Each structure stands twice: as structure tokens, then as C-alpha cells.
Amino acid sequence: HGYDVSGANNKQVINEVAREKAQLEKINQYYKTLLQDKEQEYTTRKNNQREILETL
Amino acid sequence: KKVVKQKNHVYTPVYNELIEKYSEIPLNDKL
């Protein structure tokens, strides 16, 4: 009945990599260590480590 | 006596057809 199969799969692979990108963003969002706005005792130490470290 | 179903009387080229078409199955009754 006719083979006729090409070209309509890169869109599907784009869909798979978009779901992969969403899973990667969920995994990256599962964090407790990176940026999350805290009190001044945390954040001034944070900004100081960034600054002294860019100099380092 | 029995006949031998003599003549249709019109002629044509045979042309067992060259160019082929895809043959979808038309078993689509009511559903």
C-alpha cells in the first residue's frame, strides 16, 4: 500500500528534545544550594564571596 | 443444445496496465 515515510520525524525529535529540556529544567529547579533570596547575613556573605572570588 | 457464448463484438488493445496505483482497502462499511 505505499511506503512514503520521511521528513515528518524531525518535528517529533524536536518534541522529544523539548520534553527532555523540560525534564532538565525540572532537575535543575530541584536544588537547595544555589540562588534563593535569603536574609542579609546570608546574602552579604554571598556577595562578598562572589566579589573576592572574581578577584581571585 | 448448449451454446458457447459467442461474441461481445467490440475490440480493444489489451494493455495490462503499466503505471501502478496504491490500492487502499475499501472495507469501510458503517463504522
Side-chain angles (χ1 to χ4, degrees):
Chain A
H1 293 161
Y3 214 71
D4 302 328
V5 280
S6 302
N9 52 3
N10 310 319
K11 283 87 79 185
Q12 177 262 6
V13 168
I14 276 177
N15 203 339
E16 186 191 9
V17 86
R19 202 103 174 182
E20 199 41 83
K21 184 61 186 177
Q23 293 292 129
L24 187 58
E25 207 269 348
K26 287 269 183 41
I27 284 163
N28 184 37
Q29 198 31 65
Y30 282 133
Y31 73 98
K32 308 301 144 186
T33 70
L34 270 301
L35 67 96
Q36 37 180 354
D37 278 329
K38 282 153 173 170
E39 77 255 30
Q40 297 216 341
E41 187 148 320
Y42 287 161
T43 7
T44 349
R45 216 72 165 182
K46 282 193 197 199
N47 176 65
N48 268 89
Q49 301 313 318
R50 300 155 205 184
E51 284 184 4
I52 294 174
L53 181 47
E54 197 269 331
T55 59
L56 186 135
Chain B
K1 205 258 174 186
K2 303 301 184 175
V3 290
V4 291
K5 55 177 212 172
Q6 270 86 9
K7 276 310 287 167
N8 301 157
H9 273 298
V10 58
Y11 282 144
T12 180
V14 265
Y15 188 34
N16 294 308
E17 157 64 70
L18 174 70
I19 282 303
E20 51 267 63
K21 306 194 169 304
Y22 314 156
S23 66
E24 71 270 5
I25 178 149
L27 198 65
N28 314 277
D29 41 354
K30 191 184 216 92
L31 73 154

